[PDB]
Design a protein around this ligand. Sequence first.
Ligand SMILES: Nc1ncnc2c1ncn2[C@@H]1O[C@H](COP(=O)(O)OP(=O)(O)NP(=O)(O)O)[C@@H](O)[C@H]1O
Ligand SMILES: O=C(C[C@H]1NCCC[C@@H]1O)Cn1cnc2cc(Br)c(Cl)cc2c1=O
Ligand SMILES: [Mg+2]
Length: 460
Amino acid sequence: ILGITSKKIENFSDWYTQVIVKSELIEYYDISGCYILRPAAYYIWECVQAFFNKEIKKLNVENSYFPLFVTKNKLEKGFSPEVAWVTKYGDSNLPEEIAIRPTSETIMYSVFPKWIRSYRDLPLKLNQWNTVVRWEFKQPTPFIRTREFLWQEGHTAHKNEEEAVKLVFDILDLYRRWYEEYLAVPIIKGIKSEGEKFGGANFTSTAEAFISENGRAIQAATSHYLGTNFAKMFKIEFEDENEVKQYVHQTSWGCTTRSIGIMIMTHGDDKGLVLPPNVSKYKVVIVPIFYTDENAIHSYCKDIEKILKNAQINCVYDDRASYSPGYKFNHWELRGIPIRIEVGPKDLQNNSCVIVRRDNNEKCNVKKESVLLETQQMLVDIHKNLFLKAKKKLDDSIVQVTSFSEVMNALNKKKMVLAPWCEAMKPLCIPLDQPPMPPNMKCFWSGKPAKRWCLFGRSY
Ligand SMILES: Nc1ncnc2c1ncn2[C@@H]1O[C@H](COP(=O)(O)OP(=O)(O)NP(=O)(O)O)[C@@H](O)[C@H]1O
Ligand SMILES: O=C(C[C@H]1NCCC[C@@H]1O)Cn1cnc2cc(Br)c(Cl)cc2c1=O
Ligand SMILES: [Mg+2]
């Protein structure tokens, strides 16, 4: 009951449920597919939100808030069974049903024509941090697929294709950094196939992550070039620099709290949650061991707490008298605190302490004067190690194939497949980083000549 009783490989699904609850990330809720985000989970969202905000602001993107509700006729300008409908206020029916936003396309693009008259009004760059609701038919999973989820949705409109297209890939790399620099998760940039892209999009760029334990790919984030599709539909036009009426070129992009789930599944182990330092409130936990003047142990630990905190490194000194040091060890490992500092009589004797990494459980005795410096670079190295170990697993999950039997073998081993492309397992994306393609290569399913490599696999 106390700790994680299932192993990540043996029973991944039950391991996941145990980790997210016992590490105090979420609480389950009496509405299926909805979950309470406890402070530990929301801190992660706050962090990546702060990062993403800073970066998109550099791209002159402005934050805004559009209404949670959209009327029936405006929404209705193959998704409808996912729409949640507000019908009643109190005991009175609404004259017209109103929908809860599943996304803000119809809400925003209905007003864009009013804001866009000439080239002078361009580019228009908007972003929202909000919630949307979708009554997912597929089985709900905490973070990964929820019926209400926090996200960010960006929407832009430009004078031409090139400015729009560049921003699409600018945003896509921000998503890359989002996962890499804060969640320590490696992702693959790519273009969706025509059958997998957002229907309203010209093309859909994507960031894909992969979970080796169940052999499933997860779309980490999206970034669409919408072209003039929505511009035509909503009559979003502007007057040229040459007085000619033109359609705007639009982009849209989004990343949700699914990112947190991807992080958990990536870095979590059999001991429980493992947090990248950049998304953990407490970077260090200080645990005291008695046998010995207790008050002297308190003074030493508090001194180290002051040293770290003064250097703007948030940490916690677990001085709860009712719990053994061993209990505290597991307590904070479970909650994913990157670093544990142990202080006992022996450490107090040499004016030193034991520092313990959460990721590989490596221990080392450091002098009190070197605690700060060693802590700082250890937090750096922990993030590097988490990312690199994760990248190795991602890379080792892809097999380059040129035949059907090679595909069957990879599918049976829960691997992803990199196959020739000439345009349940499905096409995931056409990776931006293309390996060389032999001149006379064919798709083994069509015989047509291959132009690029496509990534295939099962997905969430
Ligand atoms: N219910 C959900 N909970 C969490 N994240 C989600 C959910 N639905 C979609 N996302 C993610 O939100 C981002 C953009 O969503 P979106 O463009 O609506 O894709 P989508 O068409 O809903 N994909 P899918 O629902 O799996 O067929 C992607 O990274 C999705 O993985
Ligand atoms: O939501 C999208 C496309 C983009 N909109 C916001 C930015 C990120 C995102 O990729 C695809 N999508 C997904 N699910 C939907 C569910 C409903 Br219900 C509706 Cl009306 C519409 C949609 C819908 O448009
Ligand atoms: Mg969907």
